[PDB]
């Protein structure tokens, strides 16, 4: 009784075809593709340049940073103003 061949991870990247309506939404965007590249590299992965933000994505990201992540020139100025006012 040769026991059954042992279980293994499926040896390769999982590319679910996008036709069937069952392919879960989270397994179709770019995040999953990035994870596939990180795990198995360019051996069986994706075109590398996709990993970085696209230009419009970059512009909105920079907008967010400029909005919420001030620079310590600005922060130090705010601290100095508040200090003078309190004093």
């Amino acid at each position: 009784y040769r026991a059954r061949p042992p279980p293994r991870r499926r040896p390769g990247p999982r590319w679910p075809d996008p036709e069937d309506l069952l392919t879960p939404r989270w397994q179709l965007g770019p995040r999953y593709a990035a994870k596939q590249f990180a795990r198995y590299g360019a051996a069986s992965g994706v075109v590398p340049g996709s990993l970085w933000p696209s230009p419009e994505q970059l512009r909105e990201l920079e907008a967010e940073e400029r909005e919420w992540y001030p620079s310590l020139a600005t922060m130090q100025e705010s601290l100095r103003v508040k200090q003078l006012a309190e004093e």
């Binding site: 990180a38 590299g41 051996a43 920079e62 310590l72 922060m75 130090q76």
Partner: protein, 287 residues
């Protein structure tokens, strides 16, 4: 090897012979018999008997005791109050001796955690480590340490033996990346650039009396000398020693790891680092 000698005689161990340890399995109580169940423990006819008594805390219609006493904000902002896992000097010396955190190289937080010396939960708001005054005496090591807060007694204990302490801030995302670098490199993202402190911390990390990573580096030596001539130990002059090049190394703000630039993709499958070569990107990250 006496028990094996006993086993050589006793019959074969198999599934018919095994048993739990004498004490693991407390036996099961079910309500059947003159003792266990005639009312099964539920008491006489009341409201306990039927299972419907008031929710936990009720008090028979007087005001509940947890509502008479006033409401004071012992836990007002607790979700956002910052937390810091201590790393006492006893513990740092311990981890130095047993070979778990290598003191030839800089002692970053990635190294403190890859030696499993202190574990910090990124979630639950723990922002980083803090050196603490405990067993400062009996500390002896040339260690280049970067932590997220410090006490001046600890900077005394670390500099006195010829060491450099440089406090450094990390953001929540930055911290979660620092503690666990490999799973982040498995996400596929490019490395982010860590962000400057909030308003209420910038006085802390820009003053040299706390060995800030944003203070004026030319404002360090007078602070060091003041400390040395406050705790009565002669400051060593580092630049003679052979390890100065290590104690001079320091990653600059907007950097998480040492030899890696914000913006690089870490391909672990074939041992490579990929870099962005478009002007707009390289100005975005380098900022």
């Amino acid at each position: 090897a006496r028990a094996l000698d006993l086993l050589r005689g006793l019959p074969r161990v198999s599934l018919a012979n095994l048993k739990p340890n004498p004490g693991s399995k407390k036996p099961e109580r079910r309500p059947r018999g003159r003792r266990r169940g005639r009312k099964c423990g539920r008491g006489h006819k009341g409201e306990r008997q039927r299972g419907t008594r008031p929710r936990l805390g009720f008090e028979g219609g007087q005001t509940p005791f947890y509502i008479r006493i006033p409401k004071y904000g012992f836990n007002e902002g607790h979700s956002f109050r910052r937390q810091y896992k201590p790393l006492s000097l006893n513990r740092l010396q311990y981890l130095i001796d047993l070979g778990r955190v290598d003191p030839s190289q800089p002692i970053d937080l990635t190294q403190l955690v890859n030696g499993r010396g202190v574990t910090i939960q990124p979630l639950k708001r723990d922002y980083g480590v803090q050196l603490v005054e405990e067993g400062a005496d009996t500390f002896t090591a040339k260690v280049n340490i970067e932590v997220q807060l410090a006490s001046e007694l600890a900077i005394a204990a670390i500099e006195k033996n010829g060491g450099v302490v440089t406090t450094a801030f990390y953001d929540p995302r930055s911290l979660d990346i620092v503690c666990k670098p490999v799973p982040f490199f498995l996400r596929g993202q490019p490395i982010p650039k860590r962000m400057l402190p909030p308003e209420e911390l910038v006085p802390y990390y820009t003053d040299a009396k706390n060995r800030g990573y944003l203070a004026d580096p030319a404002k360090f030596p007078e602070a060091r000398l003041e400390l040395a001539r406050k705790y009565g130990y002669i400051l060593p002059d580092i630049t003679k020693d052979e390890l100065f090049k290590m104690l001079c190394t320091r990653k600059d703000p907007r950097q998480i790891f040492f030899g890696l630039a914000p913006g690089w993709v870490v391909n672990m499958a074939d041992k490579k680092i990929l870099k962005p070569t478009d002007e707009n990107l390289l100005k975005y990250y380098t900022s």
